[PDB]
Design a protein around this ligand. Structure first.
Ligand code: MG
Ligand code: MG
Ligand code: MG
Lengths: 492, 492, 492
C-alpha cells in the first residue's frame, strides 16, 4: 500500500511515493518535486542493464533528447552493480508531469537508485544526482529552466559513498576553480540525498582463469612493453596470443576438464584475456611511469591539423589528428539555430559560448564532424575540428575552443591520472573524463567511471592536468590558423 | 486458368476469381463485391502463421489501421489450424480496389479461408466473417460506409461449423439482447458463406511427455490448489518445478533415450509443462467450482481506484486496480479529434458513445492509458481508467463506461464461463471476451478463441454474466467519483 | 603521409589523394574531379561485402537515391573478389563536395577499386566506371548534370581487364548500334582508368565435395533433362535429392570423417549441391542446345496479357504473364511528376521517353507494379505491364515499351546467350542483362555479372538477340490492346 515521504532539500521538497504504482515491479517510486513527477521502477529478471526513459506529452499538454536522459540515468547506475551480475535489470522512468520550473531529469536519476534499493538488488549505492546552476555569483541546486536559460553554468553531478561517478556540464568559459567548487557544492547535496535514502532503507527495512593466466601472462607483459608498436599492431599481436591459447584448448580432447568448463562459457576466454591485459597495463602504469605506447602520464599524442581540406563550397573545412584519432569538420552557413551532428551534444555544448551574437553574425551555423578514425576522444577531436572549420568559414568566434580526455588508474592507494587516453586506457581504465574550453575557462564536461567513484580531491587534479592538455593542443592548432578569416566563402 | 464464381448474398453479390492471379501461391482468389476487390493468397512452406494485409492507394486514387485489419484476418484463422502444424503459412491480402460503398476488410477474412482451402492445407474450416450494422431498426449485412457512419452498430462476426470464433464491435449503448441478436443474425450469414465455400470445395474438387507427466503432475495440482498464493509467487513456484525436472534430465547422461529425445526438441519441456498445467487448472475449474486464486466463477477481483493521482496540470488523472492489473489514465484538453493511445482502438471505440456533442464541449480530447501492471484485461482497465480521468477533467460525459473480460473452460459437454480472467485463465483457457459499456447497454466488444468455436447459446450466457461484472465494477468506481467535476483544470 | 596524383582524363582531371584521411582503413583515397570530392575507404576484417554510400548535405549547403548509388558501387565490385573469400570487406564512400557540374557517383565506383588495391586485398581488378552522355551527335565522357538533363543518353559502364562488368542506362529510343557504340566508347575510357590504376600500383608498390558429387551427379542430370517439369516441381525434385543425401550423412555415425567435416561446415551441402546443379545445367546448354525447360536458346516463354483486370476506378489495369512471372500494373491519374513504384527506377527510366509532353497531357502519372509471381525479369514484366496499364488509362504514349532479360553461359571458348532467363539460369548463369525499349530503339539497360567480365563483342550479340525478344513480346501485347484508349476513366 501507499506511503509518502518528504525530504527537505534546498527549498524544493522532494517527495517520494512507494506502494502506489507498478505493483509487479521489484521496486518503484513516484519521485516528485514541486509539480514535476516521474515514476521510476526497477526489476531483476532471470537472464545486462536496460534503462528506458520516457517524457510523456500529456505531462505538459499533449498535442498530435530522451536518449540523452536515458544515458544520464544509465551511466551512474551501471558501475555500481557488481560485475558478476548476469540477471536482467530493467529500469523504466516515465515523466508524468512537468512543472514549468523543475526539470525532471535529475529526479529520475535519484529515483533509479531509490527503486533499486526497494527491489533489494545488490548494488554499491545508493547514488543520487543534482543539477547546479549559477545566477550572478550564486550557485543554486536543481535550478529551474529560467536559471538554466539565463545563467552561466549547467552541470549534473552524480555520486555515491565512494565519491563522484558522473559529471555533465555546460558553462560559459568558467575557470577551473569555479567548476571544481560547483562540482563539490553539488556532491554535498548528493550526499544529503544519499542520507535519507539510507534513512528510507532503515525505515522500510531493506580453474580456467589460472590456466589462461599461467599460459599467457608473461606473453602479455612483452606486447605491453613494446612501445614502438602502433595500436593496430598491438591489437593484432594480442589477438594472436589469444588465438594460440584457443588452439591449445582445442588440441586437448573432450577428456580434459577445462575444455568442458570452457565449452560451458563460450566467452570466458575473452574475459580472462582482457582481465590479464587490464592488470598488466595497470602495473605498467603505477610502478613503471610509462604508458603502453611509451608516453609519459602527462604526454599528449602528436597533433596534426589543416584548414581548407575540402573545396571552398564547403564553407569551412578542418582536419584534426591526435595519434590515430582523425576528425574532419565541415561548416555550412545559411539563412533563417547553431547546431552540430556527429557521425554531437557535447561539442555544441562546448562551442556555443564563443558563438557571436545575432547582431553581428546572422547566419545559421551548421557543423558536421566526420569521425574518420577513432583511438581516443573523438568527441574532443570533434570540438577541435569544429573550431578549425568555423575559423576557415570566417565565423568571428570569441575564442577558439579545444579539449582533451583524461583517464585514471586507481590501484588501491595508488592513483595515476592520464591525459589524452588511448582506447584501451579507456577500456581498461577507471575513468573517461572529457573537458573542453578556451584560453579563459571551461565550456563542457563529461565524466564516466567503471568503478564505484572518486573523491573530489582526485577530480580537482584531473581538471588541472587537463587544462594543460587543452592549452597545448590549442596553442598548436593556432599554428594552422590563428584568427578567423576576415571574409566568408564565395559560395556561402 | 481463370474461373469466376458468383455467390448471391444479401443484395451484394460476392464474386470469386480463381486461376487468375499469383500462380505460384498454394491457393488464391480475387474476392470482389460491388467494385471493391481484394486478392488473397495462401502458401504453406517448409519451416508459424504470418498474415500481411495491404490497402493500396491506387485502389482509390494514389497520391504522394492496416495492422488492425491484419489482426482481423489472423485471429479467426489461427485457431482453425491443427496445433501440430510447424510449416510456415504465409497469408497475403492486397486490397486492389475500394468501392465507395463496400468495405474490403470482411472480404479479406473470407478470402483467407477460400485461399487456404484451395491450397488444400489442413484446417478445421471453412470460416467466414461479415459485418452487421443497424440503420433505424433494421440490421444490415455488410453495410456500406454510409451506414457505418450513420448507424448505431458496427460489429464483425467470424464463424465456422463449430461456432463463432471472433467478434469485434462498436455500438451506441445497445442492450445485450440486441447485441446478441446482431451476433446471431450475422453468424447465420457466416453459415451461408460456409456453405458455398463447401460448394466450391465440391466443385473444384479439393515417451518424453509421459516422463514429464509422471514426474510433475502431482506437484502441479498442489500449486494450483494453493489459493493464498499470488500470481508472482505461483509463477515462481511452477518455474521451480520445471527447473528441478530439467535438473533431473541433465543429471542422467547421454546414455538415456529421453535426453536425446529432449535434445531433439529444446522446448518440449515447456510445452508439456504448460499442457499439464492447462489440464489441472481445467479440472480444478470444472469438477471443483473454484479458480486458481480461490475465486468463484462469477467473482471479480478486488477493485481499487482514485482520482487526481497526478498534479492538476494533467487535466485529468485516474488510477484503476483489478488485482495486479493497474492502469493510470491521463486526460489532456486542447483546441482545434477524440482519440486514445495505449502504452487503444478498443477503448476509444468504447468511450466515444458517451462523449458530449461539439456544441457543448469544444475541446479536443486526448487520453493516455499507462499500463503499469498486467494480469488480465489491461484494455478494460484502460476503459475504466479513461472514464475516471475524463471525470476528473470535467468532461461532461453522458454516462460512465466500464468493462470486463470473460473466459471459458470447455471440457467436452462441460462448459464454464469465467469473469475477469487471470492471465493464465486466458493462456490456458478457450476464450478472451472483452465487453465494455454503460448502465444502459454495450459500447465495445472483442472476442478471441483458441478452439474451433462456440455456439451462439454460450455467447449469450457470457454476455449476460459480463453485464454483472461491468455493473459491479462501475457501481464501485462511483464511490471514487460519481459525477464529472463541474469545472475544468486551471491549466486546461 | 599524403600524396596527390592527377590523371589526365577527357578534359576533367581526376585527382587522387592517398595518405590523407582514414588512417585505420586498409586503403583510402579522396578521389576528386573539378570540385566534386568523394572519400572511399576499404577494410578487410576477420569474419561478406558491405558497401555504404553517403551523400552529405554539407557538400552542397546543408539545411534541416543513395541506395541506388550503393548498388552501383557494389555490383561491379562483388564478382571481382575471389569466391573463396570469407573475411568481412567494408567499403565506405562519403561524398564530401558536389561540384554543380561533376556527378560523384562514378567517382566513388572508381575509388572503390583504388582503395581495394591500396588495402592490397586479393581481387581480379582493377575496375573503373564512367558515365557517357550524348549532346546532339557528340558522345561525352562523364557529362555534367546539364548534359544529363538535356541529352539523349545516360549510361554507366564499368569494366576491368576481362571486359565489361556492369551497364546501367537511360536513353531516348536510341538504336542498338548507338547504344553499342556508347558502351564501347565508355569501356575505352574505363581501360584508360584501368591503366593509371596499374600505374598507381607500380608507383606506390602494391573429400566432402567428391562424396556429394559421386552420390548425386547422375540424379541431377535427369531432373535437368526432364523438360515437362515446371519450375516448382523441379525445385521440389532437387530438394528431395539433397534431402536424401542429408539422410545418408545422418545415417552414418560420428565415426565417419565426412560427418565431422560436414558438421564443420553447416552449409557445404547446399554449396556443393548448387555447384553440381550449375555444372550440369551448363553442360546441358553448351553441348546439347536446349535449356532446362526444353526451350531453344532464343525462345521466349509463353506470354499472356489482359487489360482492365480491375474495376474502372483503377484508372488503368494491366496483367502480364511470361511463364510463371506475373505482374499487375495499376495506373492513377491526378492533378498538380511521372513516377513508378515496384512492390522501380528501371521501369520509370524505361517508360519516361514515350510519356506525352505537359502541353498535351497535364495529369500526374502514377504506376504501381504488383509482382504476383517471380521466375525471371520481374522488372521487365513491370515495364510491359506498365505500358498496358497506361494504354488502358488513355495515356497517349508515343510508342509502347517492352523488354526482356538476356543471360549468358560462358564455358571457356564456348559462349551461349539466353533470352528471357528462368530464375536458375540467372542464379547459375554468368549474366543478368535487362534491355527495354520500343519499335525504334532502346530506353533502359541494366547488366549484372558474376564473372570477371565480358568482351564488348559478346555484349553486342546479346543486345541484338534481345531486340528480337522485345519485338516478339511487344508484337504480341498489341493483340491485347493496340492503341491507347481515346478517352480516360469516369473516375479519373
Ligand atoms: Mg568512454
Ligand atoms: Mg488474449
Ligand atoms: Mg539478378
Amino acid at each position: 500500500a501507499e506511503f509518502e515521504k518528504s525530504i527537505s532539500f534546498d527549498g524544493r521538497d522532494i517527495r517520494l511515493k512507494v506502494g502506489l504504482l507498478a505493483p509487479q515491479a521489484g521496486g518503484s517510486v513516484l519521485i516528485e518535486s514541486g509539480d514535476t513527477a516521474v515514476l521510476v521502477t526497477a526489476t531483476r529478471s532471470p537472464g545486462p542493464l536496460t534503462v528506458d526513459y520516457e517524457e510523456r506529452l500529456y505531462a505538459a499538454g499533449r498535442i498530435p533528447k530522451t536518449i540523452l536522459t536515458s544515458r544520464l540515468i544509465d551511466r551512474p547506475l551501471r558501475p555500481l552493480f557488481p560485475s558478476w551480475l548476469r540477471d536482467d535489470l530493467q529500469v523504466v522512468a516515465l515523466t508524468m508531469s512537468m512543472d514549468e520550473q523543475v526539470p525532471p531529469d535529475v529526479l529520475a536519476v535519484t529515483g533509479a537508485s531509490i527503486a533499486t534499493l526497494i527491489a533489494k538488488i545488490p548494488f554499491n549505492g545508493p547514488m543520487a544526482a543534482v543539477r547546479v546552476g549559477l545566477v550572478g555569483d550564486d550557485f543554486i541546486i536543481n535550478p529551474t529552466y529560467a536559471e538554466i536559460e539565463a545563467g552561466d553554468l549547467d552541470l549534473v553531478v552524480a555520486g555515491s559513498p565512494h565519491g563522484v561517478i558522473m559529471v555533465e556540464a555546460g558553462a560559459n568559459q568558467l575557470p577551473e576553480r569555479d567548476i571544481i567548487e560547483a562540482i563539490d557544492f553539488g556532491y554535498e547535496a548528493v550526499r544529503d540525498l544519499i542520507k535519507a535514502q539510507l534513512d528510507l532503507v532503515a525505515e522500510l527495512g531493506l580453474t580456467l582463469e589460472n590456466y589462461i593466466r599461467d599460459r599467457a601472462s608473461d606473453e602479455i607483459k612483452k606486447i605491453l612493453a613494446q612501445f614502438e608498436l602502433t595500436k593496430p599492431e598491438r591489437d593484432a599481436a594480442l589477438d594472436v596470443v589469444k588465438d594460440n591459447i584457443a588452439t591449445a584448448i582445442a588440441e586437448l580432447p573432450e577428456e580434459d576438464p577445462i575444455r568442458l568448463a570452457a565449452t560451458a562459457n563460450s566467452k570466458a576466454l575473452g574475459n580472462t584475456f582482457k582481465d590479464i591485459t587490464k592488470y598488466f597495463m595497470r602495473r605498467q602504469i603505477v610502478e613503471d611511469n610509462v604508458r603502453v605506447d611509451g608516453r609519459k602520464l602527462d604526454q599528449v599524442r602528436p597533433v596534426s591539423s589543416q584548414v581548407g581540406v575540402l573545396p571552398k563550397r564547403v564553407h569551412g573545412s578542418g582536419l584534426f589528428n591526435r595519434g590515430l584519432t582523425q576528425v574532419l569538420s565541415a561548416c555550412t552557413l545559411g539563412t533563417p539555430r547553431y547546431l552540430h551532428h556527429y557521425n554531437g551534444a557535447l561539442a555544441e555544448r562546448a562551442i556555443l559560448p564563443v558563438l557571436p551574437p545575432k547582431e553581428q553574425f546572422p547566419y545559421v551555423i551548421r557543423v558536421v564532424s566526420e569521425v574518420l578514425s577513432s583511438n581516443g576522444s573523438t568527441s574532443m577531436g570533434s570540438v577541435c575540428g569544429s573550431t578549425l572549420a568555423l575559423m576557415d568559414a570566417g565565423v568571428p568566434i570569441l575564442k577558439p575552443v579545444s579539449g582533451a580526455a583524461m583517464g585514471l588508474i586507481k590501484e588501491g592507494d595508488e592513483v595515476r591520472v592520464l591525459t589524452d587516453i588511448q582506447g584501451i586506457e579507456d577500456f581498461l581504465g577507471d575513468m573517461d573524463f572529457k573537458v573542453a574550453g578556451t584560453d579563459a575557462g571551461i565550456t563542457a564536461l563529461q565524466m564516466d567511471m567503471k568503478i564505484s567513484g572518486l573523491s573530489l580531491e582526485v577530480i580537482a587534479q584531473a581538471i588541472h592536468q587537463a587544462k594543460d592538455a587543452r592549452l597545448h593542443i590549442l596553442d598548436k592548432m593556432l599554428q594552422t590558423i590563428d584568427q578567423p578569416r576576415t571574409e566568408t566563402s564565395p559560395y556561402a
